[PDB]
Amino acid sequence: QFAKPEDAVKYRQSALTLMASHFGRMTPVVKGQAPYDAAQIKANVEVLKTLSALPWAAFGPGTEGGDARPEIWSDAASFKQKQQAFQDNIVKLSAAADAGDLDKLRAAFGDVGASCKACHAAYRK
Amino acid sequence: QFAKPEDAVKYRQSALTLMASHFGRMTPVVKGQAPYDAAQIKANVEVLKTLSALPWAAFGPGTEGGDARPEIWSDAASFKQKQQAFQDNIVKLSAAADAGDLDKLRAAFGDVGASCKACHAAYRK
Ligand code: HEC
Numbered sequence: 001q002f003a004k005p006e007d008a009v010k011y012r013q014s015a016l017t018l019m020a021s022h023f024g025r026m027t028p029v030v031k032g033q034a035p036y037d038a039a040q041i042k043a044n045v046e047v048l049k050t051l052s053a054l055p056w057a058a059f060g061p062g063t064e065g066g067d068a069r070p071e072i073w074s075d076a077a078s079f080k081q082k083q084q085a086f087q088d089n090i091v092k093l094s095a096a097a098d099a100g101d102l103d104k105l106r107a108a109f110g111d112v113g114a115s116c117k118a119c120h121a122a123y124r125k
Numbered sequence: 126q127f128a129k130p131e132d133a134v135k136y137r138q139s140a141l142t143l144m145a146s147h148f149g150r151m152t153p154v155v156k157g158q159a160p161y162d163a164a165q166i167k168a169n170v171e172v173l174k175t176l177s178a179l180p181w182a183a184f185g186p187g188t189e190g191g192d193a194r195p196e197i198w199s200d201a202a203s204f205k206q207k208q209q210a211f212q213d214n215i216v217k218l219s220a221a222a223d224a225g226d227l228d229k230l231r232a233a234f235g236d237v238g239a240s241c242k243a244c245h246a247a248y249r250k
């Protein structure tokens with residue numbers, strides 16, 4: 001869907017910005033600093049689930065740029081592993097949010113965050 | 126969810142960028158220049174539906190900036206009308222995509238585009 005590589009960069013950066021907002025806005029809730037409304041978090045995680053599937057299609061062949069390391073493309077299987085692991089952890093977060101269980105939400109949220117950090121370390125400049 | 130007004134600006138700009146990609150990538154399909162796969166478009170419109178609900182919460186009080194005209198805030202009822210009309214047209218696009226009807230998709234897509242343009246004219250610098 002991208003006329004030039006730059007367009008893919010702009011898309012993924014926006015997707016990741018949104019993803020990050022929908023994840024990080026739950027921090028005060030998982031820490032207990034903000035109240036836990038199970039329905040609010042369920043709805044928010046549903047949005048996060050949608051967003052978290054979006055960035056990966058915008059790292060297609062030839063879309064090198066932004067802060068993406070070139071190893072995303074030359075190690076495609078390893079990058080794909082990190083993104084599928086992250087998405088699998090999003091599935092676990094969805095299950096916790098759907099269950100309305102603050103303890104499971106906290107644990108699942110920590111797993112997601114670690115998946116973000118792991119891909120960041122390997123694949124972001 | 127925004128620590129500073131700038132954060133809201135960055136969020137809405139990213140949401141609108143994504144929204145725009147998910148809408149505009151269907152242009153060649155509605156024009157017949159790309160093939161029409163009803164399931165592909167149904168799935169894409171589902172993503173667009175999610176995205177199209179997101180920007181409005183990031184124009185909260187005191188989040189003036191970006192290319193947002195200040196009239197968004199001083200004419201809140203009029204801005205809200207444009208966004209709800211746009212979202213209602215997204216509902217019509219969803220129905221067309223769910224029905225797998227290229228004719229209805231084309232018409233619904235044109236209505237959505239006109240809603241984008243109308244808000245742009247009134248509320249974007
Ligand atoms: C690889 C499988 C990743 C996972 C999982 C996550 N992110 Fe990431 N992120 C990744 C890359 C390669 C990049 C750079 C993209 C580019 O072309 O510049 C990023 C970038 C971000 C950004 C900045 C986006 C911007 O506005 O420029 C943010 C804020 C970000 N990533 C956040 C983030 C979070 C919160 C994640 C889990 C919820 C997450 N990322 C996962 C690669 C990967």
Ligand code: HEC
Nearest residue numbers: 138141142145148190191192193207208211241244248249
């Ligand atoms: C009001 C109810 C709007 C509707 C409906 C749409 N858009 Fe819009 N858009 C609006 C504003 C006020 C702004 C400026 C936001 C800011 O703070 O700068 C925008 C901006 C865009 C952008 C640019 C985003 C960026 O990266 O800076 C795009 C690409 C855009 N809008 C596209 C677009 C499309 C395709 C719409 C319908 C599918 C659409 N907008 C609707 C206000 C409104």
